[PDB]
Design a protein around this ligand. Structure first.
Ligand code: NAP
Ligand code: NAP
Ligand code: DAR
Ligand code: DAR
Lengths: 307, 307
């Protein structure tokens, strides 16, 4: 039994390295493998752990030995899970470690946009005080927040919202009834929400789910929050919406690209570099989930299986 | 009956101008009077409304005619209410208009400090993605927040802290019990709080309530929030705490002074220019309190009376 963390871990403390070596031969690579290194590392192990590296169907056809792949992430959009299924390789993610961290980040971003924290701080650094007109804001209490995706993270955001005394609406794919969330279609969500937050995986179905048309339905003072992939939005259309001040602002933890992206020029966005998840509590839970995946698989009762 | 708003109103919309003109002659000065002009304006009116101008005992003893002074603010630390009472001038404030806006600003500041929003946004503007280590944060869920002052605004903060499922401790002067808040003395509050937030008026008793000694008791990762007057804190001692990184950071909506204040040079503070209160909802409620004050005085049963 060989277990391999095939690319550079953000967090992998000594106690976890020691624990995983109790289960088998554990090897960790502190780099980003090229495609050939990735195939070789995947083919030299029985369980693999991945954080950064795309695993494509073309790669999986060249893989041998590997039986179990764990994404350290909740997302698995960079892994061809269907191709792994077709090659009898089981896949698990780490499904809940970050949900509180990300839900709190939604409110961090929402408040940073609403209160224009970037401009407000810069005003004070200029030595100006008691400046109100540029910072006229809306209270979030009693506003409508619309959650596109109401799973682990969406439901955590709803809990915080519902006790901020907000109206929570939302949508999912299965139409399973989620408690405390009035479920609507996406057109109504875009029309009625004061705040819109995305909590949905990226795949072929959800890419560019926020079309130019749907974005044009937003309220004139709406705030859009994205702690998910930038590819979920027509990003060029979002730029035009913000550039033309057709909504209040956006808080974005991901963009489809960064260098020379015109959104970087906007004074009504707040950007974070994918840091929504990274709390002390989340990264520790991430380790507990990784270890639970390994133990449960060795017990022949695997958990968090992606199917 | 003559009513005068003696200095520049931040907000005085059409419906308020029209309503106050029903009671008599309404004059508004869209400027900032000096002391002599303030005395003259106050002495040339029956009811006065004030927003910016200090009204000292020396001025009050020179005033005639005036019977009722309304501060548009909740604070009245710039008005000598004792001298007003001794000269048989009634005084009211506007006591609740901003409590939701300020309570939400506490969390806007808390999250801005905790998630290092200023630095995170700057990282993205430099074109960098997936930068985690500098932004390692604590979730605020299950943390202890200590509220110095648990009146109108403090209790609103306490309600939001329960929304995030935090432990709330606090103190007041009367030691009257407040439900949902575990009351402690200030030494215990400074020692046990992960987040400290001030919600206390500025007066002879509360100035520099946060001493150098009390500030030295703070937890190494504590976050201090001040939406009240900067003079509640030994500000030089606070600078020393932050400069030496003895706590995580501070979110400050006021400073004792701004020009060349060394706090402006700190990378672990988030500053807002007194903008905590300024929501659409708050300024509208401010007008309804102004009207209720005027009408109550006209009915010879004044409300919101100071002292
Ligand atoms: N920024 C960060 O640091 C960070 C950290 C972790 C995760 N994330 C992102 O957050 C995403 C969500 O995580 P989660 O744990 O909340 O996922 P989850 O529990 O799987 O929930 C996903 C939600 O999206 C819904 N959904 C899926 N496909 C849909 C479609 N085509 N149309 C409408 N709704 C659809 C699901 O509906 P059903 O229940 O009906 O299937 C469910 O309500 C992840 O995929 C990841 O990309 C970001
Ligand atoms: N940043 C902004 O834009 C903004 C906007 C509005 C207000 N404010 C500030 O917020 C302050 C508080 O407003 P509020 O409406 O919450 O006031 P409030 O309802 O009068 O509450 C004041 C609280 O402070 C307590 N307190 C008074 N003196 C004290 C002392 N010496 N030691 C300990 N506790 C003491 C009171 O306790 P007892 O009940 O036992 O007396 C009460 O719990 C205002 O004075 C104002 O300066 C700021
Ligand atoms: N956990 C970790 N080492 N990386 C964070 C990844 C965040 C988000 N994409 C996700 O979890 O899907
Ligand atoms: N409401 C108004 N025009 N000014 C806001 C003043 C905020 C705070 N000092 C207070 O109300 O005490």
């Amino acid at each position: 039994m060989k277990i391999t963390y095939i690319d550079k871990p953000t967090y992998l403390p000594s106690w976890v390295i020691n624990k995983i070596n109790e289960y088998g031969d554990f090897e960790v690579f502190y780099d980003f493998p090229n495609e050939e290194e990735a195939i070789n590392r995947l083919s030299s192990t029985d369980i693999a752990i991945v954080e950064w590296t795309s695993i494509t169907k073309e790669m999986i056809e060249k893989i041998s030995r590997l039986k179990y792949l764990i994404t350290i992430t909740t997302s698995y959009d960079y892994i061809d899970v269907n191709s792994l299924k077709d090659n009898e390789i089981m896949v698990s993610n780490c499904p809940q470690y970050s949900k509180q961290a990300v839900a709190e980040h939604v409110f961090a971003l929402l408040f940073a946009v609403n209160r224009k924290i970037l401009q407000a701080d810069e005003t004070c650094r200029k030595g100006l005080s008691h400046i109100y007109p540029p910072f006229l804001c809306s209270e979030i209490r009693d506003k409508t927040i619309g959650l596109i995706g109401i799973g682990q993270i969406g439901q955590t955001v709803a809990e915080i919202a519902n006790a901020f005394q907000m109206k929570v609406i939302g949508l999912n794919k299965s139409k399973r009834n989620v408690k405390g969330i009035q479920q609507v279609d996406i057109t109504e969500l875009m029309k009625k929400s004061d705040i819109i937050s995305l909590h949905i995986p990226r795949n072929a179905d959800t890419e560019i789910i926020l079309t130019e048309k749907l974005l044009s339905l937003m309220k004139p003072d709406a705030v859009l929050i994205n702690t998910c992939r930038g590819n979920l939005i027509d990003e060029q259309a979002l730029y035009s919406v913000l550039k033309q001040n057709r909504i209040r602002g956006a808080g974005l933890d991901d963009l489809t690209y960064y260098k020379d992206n015109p959104i970087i020029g906007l004074n009504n966005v707040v950007l974070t570099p994918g840091s929504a998840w990274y709390s002390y509590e989340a990264r520790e839970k991430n380790m507990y989930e990784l270890i639970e995946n390994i133990e449960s698989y060795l017990a022949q009762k695997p958990v968090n299986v992606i199917l």
